[PDB]
Each structure stands twice: as C-alpha cells, then as structure tokens.
C-alpha cells in the first residue's frame, strides 16, 4: 500500500557533491528505492524511495552533510 515516498531535504551540499555520496550510500538499496533528485539552488534533494523517513535521515546523515530541515510528500 504504501509506495516510492517523496521525501524532500534541505541539505547544504555547497557546490561539489553532485550526486556523488549521497548516490553512493543509496547504491546499498537501490531494490528499495527509485530515485533521488538534487537542487543545487535552493540546497534541496528529493530521495523517492518505500523506506521509513528515519531510514533516509540516517543514510543522509552517513555522507556528513548538513540537513537543515525535510519533509515526506
């Protein structure tokens, strides 16, 4: 019942990142997950995945980048 979420962060990638470890600590569940999404811009990344929000939080948090505030959609 409950799908691929959209969760959605502000996470401070300033400049460098583009996708790289924030790609690679997902590759681990890539069978549950469908994708991510990154806007430099406004320092948002969506991560569309059926895994709990906590879970997402935690793989975010494995890359050491800062995450302001998130959101599920």
Do not use: W
């Amino acid at each position: 019942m409950a799908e691929i979420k959209h969760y959605q962060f502000n996470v401070v990638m300033t400049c460098s990142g583009c996708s790289g470890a924030v790609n690679k600590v997902l590759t681990k569940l890539e069978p549950d997950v469908s994708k991510i999404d990154i806007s430099l811009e406004k320092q948002l990344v969506d991560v569309y995945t059926t895994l709990p929000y906590d879970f997402i939080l935690e793989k975010i948090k494995k890359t050491g980048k800062e995450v302001r505030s998130g959101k599920q959609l």
